[PDB]
């Protein structure tokens, strides 16, 4: 399933851990529109912290 | 002939038939919800019903 949450808004965490669970045994792909974030590049020297 | 009804007539009857629970309905095991409250009230549909 690729799964789509537009918003995680009322989710029961019950599901949440359902659904990722999913993702690791079912192999579904999720996507969270939702989330908004920065994103920084490591070098693979400075690992990540 | 079938059987009249015991309230039908002015008898005494204390012999009976009583249906019952075998054991306390009362278990113990309450039900219990995952209240999930709006993410912001201003974005809450009042409209519509």
């Keep these: 399933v690729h799964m789509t949450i537009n918003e995680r808004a009322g989710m029961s965490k019950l ?3 359902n659904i990722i ?3 690791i ?3 579904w792909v999720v996507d969270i529109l939702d989330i908004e974030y920065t994103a920084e590049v490591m070098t693979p020297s400075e690992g990540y912290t | 002939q079938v059987g009249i009804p015991k309230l039908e007539v002015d008898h005494i009857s204390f012999s009976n038939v009583v249906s019952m629970m075998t054991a306390n309905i009362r278990t113990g095991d309450d039900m219990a919800v995952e209240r999930v409250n709006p993410d912001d009230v201003r974005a809450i549909n009042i409209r519509n019903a």
């Design chain 1, 15 to 17: 599901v949440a851990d």
């Design chain 1, 21 to 23: 669970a999913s993702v």
């Design chain 1, 25 to 27: 045994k079912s192999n």
